[PDB]
Amino acid sequence: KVPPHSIEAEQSVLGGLMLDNERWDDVAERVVADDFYTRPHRHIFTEMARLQESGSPIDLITLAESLERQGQLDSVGGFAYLAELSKNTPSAANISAYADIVRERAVVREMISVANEIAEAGFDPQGRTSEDLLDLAESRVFKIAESRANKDEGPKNIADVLDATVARIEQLFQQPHDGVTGVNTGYDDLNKKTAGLQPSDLIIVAARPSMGKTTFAMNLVENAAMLQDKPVLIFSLEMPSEQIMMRSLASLSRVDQTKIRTGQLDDEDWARISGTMGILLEKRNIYIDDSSGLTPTEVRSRARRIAREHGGIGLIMIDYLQLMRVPALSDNRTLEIAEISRSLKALAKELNVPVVALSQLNRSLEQRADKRPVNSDLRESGSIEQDADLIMFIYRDEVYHENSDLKGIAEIIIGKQRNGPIGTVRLTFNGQWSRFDNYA
Amino acid sequence: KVPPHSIEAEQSVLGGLMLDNERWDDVAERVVADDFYTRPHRHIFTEMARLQESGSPIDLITLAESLERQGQLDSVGGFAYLAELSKNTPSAANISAYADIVRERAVVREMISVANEIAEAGFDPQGRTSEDLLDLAESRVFKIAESRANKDEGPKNIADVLDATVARIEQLFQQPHDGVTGVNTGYDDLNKKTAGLQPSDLIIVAARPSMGKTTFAMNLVENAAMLQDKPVLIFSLEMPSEQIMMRSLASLSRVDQTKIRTGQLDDEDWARISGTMGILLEKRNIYIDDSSGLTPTEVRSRARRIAREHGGIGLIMIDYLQLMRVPALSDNRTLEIAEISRSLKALAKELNVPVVALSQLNRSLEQRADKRPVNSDLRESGSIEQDADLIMFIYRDEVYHENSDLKGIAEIIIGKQRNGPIGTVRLTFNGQWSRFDNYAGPQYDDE
Amino acid sequence: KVPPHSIEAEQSVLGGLMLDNERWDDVAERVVADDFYTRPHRHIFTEMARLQESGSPIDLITLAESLERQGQLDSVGGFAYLAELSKNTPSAANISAYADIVRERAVVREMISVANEIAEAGFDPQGRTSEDLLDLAESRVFKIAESRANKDEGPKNIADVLDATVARIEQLFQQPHDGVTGVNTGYDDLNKKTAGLQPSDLIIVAARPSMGKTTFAMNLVENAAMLQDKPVLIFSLEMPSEQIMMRSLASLSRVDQTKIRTGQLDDEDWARISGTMGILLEKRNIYIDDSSGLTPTEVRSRARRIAREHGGIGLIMIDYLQLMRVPALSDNRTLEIAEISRSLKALAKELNVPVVALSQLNRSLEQRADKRPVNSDLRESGSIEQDADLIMFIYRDEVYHENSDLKGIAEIIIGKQRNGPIGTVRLTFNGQWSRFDNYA
Amino acid sequence: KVPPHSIEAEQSVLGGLMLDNERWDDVAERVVADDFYTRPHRHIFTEMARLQESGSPIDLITLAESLERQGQLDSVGGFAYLAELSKNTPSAANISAYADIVRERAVVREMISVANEIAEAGFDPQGRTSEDLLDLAESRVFKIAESRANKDEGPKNIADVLDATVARIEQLFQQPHDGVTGVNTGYDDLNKKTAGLQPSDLIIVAARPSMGKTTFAMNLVENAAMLQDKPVLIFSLEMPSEQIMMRSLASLSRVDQTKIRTGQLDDEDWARISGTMGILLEKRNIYIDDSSGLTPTEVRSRARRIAREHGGIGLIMIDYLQLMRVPALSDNRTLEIAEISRSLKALAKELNVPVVALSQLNRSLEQRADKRPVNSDLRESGSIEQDADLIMFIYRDEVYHENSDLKGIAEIIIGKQRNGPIGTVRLTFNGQWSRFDNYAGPQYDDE
DNA sequence: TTTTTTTTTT
Ligand SMILES: Nc1ncnc2c1ncn2[C@@H]1O[C@H](COP(=O)(O)OP(=O)(O)NP(=O)(O)O)[C@@H](O)[C@H]1O
Ligand SMILES: Nc1ncnc2c1ncn2[C@@H]1O[C@H](COP(=O)(O)OP(=O)(O)NP(=O)(O)O)[C@@H](O)[C@H]1O
C-alpha cells in the first residue's frame, strides 16, 4: 500500500521557508525533518535548520551552497530541483495549515508503522507472553500520544492566565462549600487547615513502624469513601488485603481488632460488621491492589484503567514509597525515590486526584532528644519534600515515653503545606478499635 | 498469513470434556466458544454449554443426539468426527493448560485483527482526524486489555475481599483452635499475644551473642514439630548441625548440655535420648541444611523442592541473617539486608509459611543506660522493621547485671506486632539443659 | 569420525520426561541441554526446562505449543516427531541410567573436543611457548574434571543428623585419645584443647607477620614433622626459603637469630644446626614450594599435583595470608578472607590436610587501647571474628605494650573453636631464638 | 600433517660437534638422540655419544670409521652425507640455541603424539571409565612435564635445600666483612635493614609532591657516586638537570639552595662548590638525561649503550614512573604502568644494577587520619607491588601538622622488602641545604 | 581515574 503523504504540502512549506524566514519558527514548532515523507525533503529541512541555527537567512543560494558543502546537493535532486521548489510556491500565508497537514500525515504513518510492528509481534511471539505484547502495544500507543501532545507547551500571555484565574475564582465563589475545598477528610480540624484533600496534591504522611500510620491512612480512606461517591484506589503493597479489611472492620464498627483476628466475635458485633459490609456494597467504590514491587508506570496504567472504566478516581492510596521498585534506577535508592515521586506527582497532576502516599523515617529522630519529626527525618528526603505539597508527621509521645500524659493523643504535625500555615492536629487514637477520632 | 491457532489443544479440550464433566467449570471460566478457531468447534462448545446448563452429563451420545436435534451434527463434521475427538484425547488432567493455550491463541488473533482494523483506519481516514483515530486505537487496546487479565483475575476490588474476609472469620469462629490460629509455639503466653505462628509472617528474634537466641529458636522448632505434622526446614548457617542437635537433645530430654558436650552420659539419659530419637524418627519432619552463605534464591529453590516432595513446609528456620550472602549486593551490607528481607518476605507470602529469621543487634545497646533492645538497635535493620510483622527481642538482665533478680527470666519483648498490641513475655531459661519454658512464677506486668 | 553419542537414550529420557514429571529432578541433576548430541534435542530439553520452571507439567501438547510460540516447532522436526518420541518410550523406570549414559557420552565428546584443541595448539604454536601449551592443557583437563563434579548441597534428613551427632558424642565420650587426636601440634595446651592438628580443618592464626606468628607456624611445622614422615608442603608468602630456613634453625637449635643471620663463627651453634638438619634429613618429608600471589583453587590443584608426585600431605604452611590480595576485594578484605577461608576448608576436606593460615591484622593492634586482638584490631572484623573454624589471635603484649603484661604468658585467644574450650591460651615465647614454647 | 621439526638445526648441531668437541657437554645436557627428528640423525648422535664416552675425539673420519664398523654408515646416508653435514655448519658458537630449538621441537612432537594417544583412547574407551581416561590424560601430561622436570622447577626438596642451607651458612660466614652487601646507601640505618642497594632490585621510593623524594633520591645518588667508581645514569624526566645540579651542589657543599638559586653566593661557599666540582670531575661517573616522555625501550637502549661504552652502570635513576610514557599502552594508565614496571624489572635483572625508580601517591592518604603511606596508597598500585622488592615511603608529620615534634625527622617506612624485615628509618632533613643525614637523636622503638 | 549526594552502621 501507498503510505499516506502530501508531497505538495511539503513543497509549499519548503518554498515558503525559502521566501519567508519569519514564519520559520512556526514550521520548526510544528514539524521536524522526520515528518517529511521523502528523504531528500528531510535533508533539505535539516540543512535549513542548520543554516537558521547559524543565523544565516534561508535563501536558495546559501541552501544550495550548504548542500554542496555537505555533498547533499546531488542527492536531493540538484540545484534545478531547488529552483523548481522555490518557483512553485506562490506564498506562505497558509504555511501553518500545510505544516499541520504534514504533521497529520506523519502521525498517521507513524500509527500505521506501529500497527505493522504490533501485527509482526503478534505473528511472531518469539517466546513473549500475551501480557508482554499488551504492555508493548500500550507503551507504543502512549508514545504516539505523547508525540502528538507537543503543541500544548508554549509561553502564553498574562491575559490568558488572568482570564483562567478569574473564571476559576468566579467558579469557586459561585459554588458553596463551607470550607470543604478538597475531598472531605472526616476530621473537623483537618478540614480547617487543609480545607479538604485538594486534587493534584502529593499527600505524604510518614511515620515510624507500628505507629498507626497505615491505620490512619485507612481511616482517611474510609472517611473519604463515606463522604464521596467517586471511586478510590488502594495500593497495599506491604499490608495484605485481609489485614486491611480486618482493620477497616475494626475501625468502622468500633470493635477490638484482637477478637476479630481471633474470630471470637459475638452476634451483635457480627450484625454491626454485616451492616458495615452492606454500606460497603452500597458504595462498591474501593479497589485494593495488594501486589508489591510495582513500577509507577504500572500504577499509572491501572489508575488510567480505573478512571476510564469508573469515571475518574476519588483517591489513590499507596502503602509507602520505600516499597516501590523501579528496575531502571534500582542501583541508587535516592534516584529511584526521586523518579517515583516525580512520576506520581505527574500522575496526580494528570488525573487531578489527591494521592495519599505514605513513607518511612530515619533513625536520627531517635538520636535527637526531641523526637518530633522534621523534614530531614524523612527517609531519603529532599525530592520527597520538593515534589509533595501536603506533608504531615505523626507524633505520639505515649509511644516514646511511658510516663507521657499524651496517651491516646496523636499529634499529626504538618511538615509542609505550600498553601496555608502548617500546624499540629491532636487526635484520639484507639489501639483496640484502631480508630482515629477528633480530639475534644 | 495463517492465523495463530492450536487445533490440537481444542480437540484435547473437547475430548476431555466428553470424558470428564467435573472440570467443565474451569473451561467455562477460562474460555468460551468464540475462543475456538474453527466454527464447528464453536458449535460444539455452544452445544456442550447448552447441555451442561440443562444439567445433562457431557458424553458422546447425548451430545450427538443434541446436535442431531438442532441439525448441527453435519455442521460440526459428523458423529465420526466427534468419536475421533473423544478417542484422541488420553486424559483431561492438563485441560486447564490447554484452555490457557486456547485463550492465548484467541487473544493473539484478536490483537492481530484489531491491528488490521487500526491499519485500515490509518490508510483510510474517512474524514476522521488524527485525534479520532488515536482515541479509536486507545479504545480498541483498552477493550483487549479488558479481555485479558481483567477483573476476572481480581487485581483490585472490594466485594471479593469482603467475601474472603468473612469466610476466614467464619472459619476461625467455627474452628476450635482456642486462641492458637497459627502454628503452635508451645508457649501459652506467646500463643496469647501472637496467637501462634501465623503463616506468611517474617519472625525476627533478635538478641546479643550468648543469649540463647539459636537455643530459643530451636526450642520453638521442637515445639512446632511436636505440635504439628507438616515438615519443617532448618537453615543452620551459623552453628553446625551437630551442636544444634546436641542442644535439641539437651532441651527435649532435659539433660545438661555440658555433660553431652563432654559425652559423659549415664544410661538413663541415654535411654531418654533414644526415646526422643524414636519420636523424631516417627515424625521425620525435620530437615537441616547447614550450608553457609546461601543466597535467598537457593533457599527459595530448596523450600520449593521440599514443599513439592513432602507436601508443603510447616516452618522455615534461618540461623541469623547476616550470614546470608548476596553476591550481587555484597558491595553494601544494607542493600544485602534489604534484598534478603524482601526475598524472604516474598517467599513467606508465596508458600504461606511462618519464616523464623534470627538477627543480631547493635553496640548501642551497651551504650544506653537501659539495655532493652529496640527496633533501631537491630544490626542494620533498614527494611527489617518494615517487612517483618513478628519482631521480638531477647532481654537477659542476668547477663548484663550480676545482681539482677531476673536470673533465668528471659524477657521476649515484641518490638513490632502489626495485628495486635505489643508486650513482654517472660520465660524461664535453663542454661544447663538450654531450655526455654513458660514462666510459672509471679506474673509481672508488661510495662 | 562419528562422535560417541546415544540418541536412543536421549529419546528414552525425553519420552520418560513426557510421561513422568516426578523424575524430572533426577534428569535435571544429571544432565543439561548441552549434553544432548543433536541441537533439536537441546531445544526440546530447553523448552522442557522452561515449562517446568514455570510450574507447568511437561506433556506433548504444551511442549509443542511452546515450541510453536518460540517458532522452534518446525526446527526440531515438527509435532509428528515429538509424538513419535513420546510413543517410542515405554516407561521412565530406568531414566536415571539413560541420563547417566547420556552424561558419559557428553563428557567423552567433550574430552575428544579438548584433545582436538590441544592437537591444534600443538600443530600451530601461534608464538606460545611449550610451557604455555602444557599449562593450557592442564587447565583444560582440570576444567573437564571440575565439570565432572556432582551434587554438593542438600537439606540433610533428621536421621543423618542424628547419626552424625551420636557419632560425635561417642567420639567425645568413648575414645580415650587423651588430648591429641590428629597430627600433634607440639604445644601442650594446643595438644589438650585443639586435640592436635586435626586433618580436614581450618586453623587460621591471626597476628602480625614477623611478630611471633611466623615462628609459631614454623614451630607447628617442626613439631608435626618430628612425629611423622608424611610429606609436608611449604607455601610461605612472607619470607623466602632461605629466611624461613634461618628462622627454623634458630627456633629448633635455640640459637639467637642475630648469630644465624649475621655470621658469628662458632662450632657449638654449627653442631646444633648439624643435629637439626640431621633430624630433618631423617624425617625427609619437607618439600619446599613457597611462592606468592595465588588463590586457594590453585593451592588445591597443587595439592592434587603433589599427591600425584608422592601422595598424602602432612601439613601446608600458609604464611602471610594477606599476601594473596585480589585488587577487586583488596579494599574490603573481609569478604576476600572469608572466601579464601571457605576454599581452604574445601581443600582441607578434599585431601585430608590440616590447612593452617597466617592471617594479618591491622596496625591498631599496637594503636587501639584494647591491645588484645578484638574487632577493632581485626582486619575490618568480619571473617576474622567468624567463618574460620580455629581463629587463634596472638595477643603478644610484648610488642603492643612496652611494659608488657604478658611476658611468657602471651595469650593465644581463640575466638571460635570447634573442638576444645575457647579462651586466652598463655604461651611462652623466646624472642632471642624466635621460638614459641608452651606455658603451663 | 607434517610433524614440527627443524632439520637445519640438527645439521648445524652435528656439524658443530664434528668441528668442536668442547661444547659436546652442553649438547648432551640439553638433548638426546631421541630429540633428533630423522632416524639417521639419531644414529649419528648415538655414534657420537658412544665415541665420546670412549674418549675418542669427534671428527669426520673417526665417526665414519665407527659407523662403518657397526654397518650404520649406509643407514645414515653415507660418507658423502657426513661430509656435507660437516661442510654446511660454519661455526658452533650458537649450537646451544640450536639444541634448545631441537629440544623444543621434540617437546612439541611428544605433546602431539600424546594428544593423538589421548584422542585415540577417547574415541575407543575399551571399557575404561571417564575417570580412567581422565587419570590417563593427567598422567601423560605429567610425564611430559616430568621430561623437563630439571628444567622447569622452583624450590628444592629437603636434602637439596639442606645442602643449600649449609652452603649459605658458609657464605654468610664471609658476610660480616663490611655489613653492606650491595651498593652503599651512605646511611648507617639504611645499610642495616636493606644492607645497601642490592643489584637487580626495583627500589620504589614514593612520596607526596614537594616531599623531598627527588631530593632524597639525589642524596642517595651523590652518596653512591662518592662511594663507588662505577658510572651512574640519571633520568631526570620531571625536573631539568639545572635544578638537579643546584640541589646536588646545595646538598654536597651544605650551602642554602635559595642563595644558589638567587646566585648571591660568597667566595668561601664558591670555593666549596669549586672543590665539589673538582671532586666530581675526578669522578666523572654521572650521566644525566633530562628528556621527558621516554619509553622503557629507549631507556634500555641507552643503558645498554652506556654499559657497553663505560663497562657497566653503577646506578640507574628514574624521576618518578608516571612521567614515563608508552604510546602503545597510552589508552590505559594502569596497563602502561604495569608494562613500564615489568620492562624496568627485566632491565634491572638483565644488567644486575639497582634501579632508582621513584613514584607518586594517591589522595586517599590525606583522607586517612593517619597519613602514613601504605602499599595500596600507591598511585596506580598492584603491579608495582608485584614487580618491586624495595618499596619505601617518605613520611613527614611536620608537613601535615604544624605542631608536630618530628620537625626535621623524615621517616622512610619500608612497605615491601622481599629479603629482610621492613622498618622505619628516621633521618634528619635540612631544608636549607636539602640534605638528608642520619638521625643522630634518640632512637624511637617502633611500636 | 576523578567527582558529587544520600541512608545505614561502628
Ligand atoms: N488489637 C490491637 N490492640 C492494640 N493496638 C493495636 C491492635 N491492633 C493494632 N494495634 C496497633 O496499631 C498500630 C499499627 O500501626 P501500623 O500503621 O500498622 O504501622 P505501620 O507504620 O503502618 N507499619 P509500616 O508502614 O510497615 O512501618 C500499632 O501501634 C499496633 O500496636
Ligand atoms: N632553599 C630551601 N629552603 C628550604 N626548603 C627548601 C629549599 N629548597 C627546597 N626546599 C624544600 O625541599 C623540598 C623539595 O623536594 P623535591 O624533591 O623537589 O619534591 P619532589 O618530591 O621532587 N616533588 P614530586 O616529584 O611531585 O614528588 C620541599 O619540601 C621544599 O620546601
Ligand SMILES: [Mg+2]
Ligand atoms: Mg504502614
Ligand SMILES: [Mg+2]
Ligand atoms: Mg620529584
